[PDB]
């Protein structure tokens, strides 16, 4: 499965693997479904290591999942930041995975078995580009001018 992101500056597609993460998946897939997404910034914005989104507060401190409650992670030996687009939950700890994910801009290894990746960027590389480069306050690494998520593709499968 598939999801679009439709922002300020372009769209991102991104590949869920809801087979090594179904729960991960059930709720992205849930939320990006039910607009929760929608109007969200792009908080968080560190160019060479990752941005981050889906915290409708927009603070980095706000967002929960689908259930109203955090959820376990979901690691994988099979799943490693170790490209440019890796996306995934941000968390403050073990276990506390809400609505907040991010887009990698390079191999992290650090992150590995800390966080739970749960997809890739497959299209939409140089809108990737576009918010790597967007201005921060140096101290924040928020975007001097707010980059929304408009609204959100879900790419239904044909099959059932
Ligand atoms: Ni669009
Ligand atoms: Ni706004």
Same mark, same amino acid.
Request: aromatic share 10%; hydrophobic share 30%; net charge negative.
């Given at each position: ?50 941005? @981050? ?9 706000? +967002?929960?999942? %689908?259930? !109203?409650?955090?959820?376990? =992670? /979901? ?32 191999? @992290? ?9 749960? +997809?890739?960027? %497959?299209? !939409?590389?140089?809108?990737? =580009? /576009? ?30």
């Amino acid at each position: 499965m598939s999801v679009t992101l439709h922002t300020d500056v372009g769209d991102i597609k991104i590949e869920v693997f809801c087979e090594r993460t179904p729960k991960t998946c059930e709720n992205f897939l849930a939320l990006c479904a039910s607009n929760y997404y929608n109007g969200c910034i792009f908080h968080r914005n560190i160019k060479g290591f990752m941005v @981050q989104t889906g915290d409708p507060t927009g603070t980095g401190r706000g +967002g929960n999942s %689908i259930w !109203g409650k955090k959820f376990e =992670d /979901e690691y994988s030996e099979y799943l490693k930041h170790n490209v440019r687009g890796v996306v995934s939950m941000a968390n403050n700890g073990p276990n506390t995975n809400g609505s907040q994910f991010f887009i990698t801009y390079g191999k @992290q290894p650090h992150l590995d078995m800390k966080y739970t990746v749960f +997809g890739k960027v %497959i299209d !939409g590389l140089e809108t990737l =580009d /576009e918010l790597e480069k967007l201005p921060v306050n140096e101290k924040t690494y928020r975007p001097l001018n707010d980059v929304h998520i408009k609204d959100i593709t879900i790419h239904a499968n044909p099959f059932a």
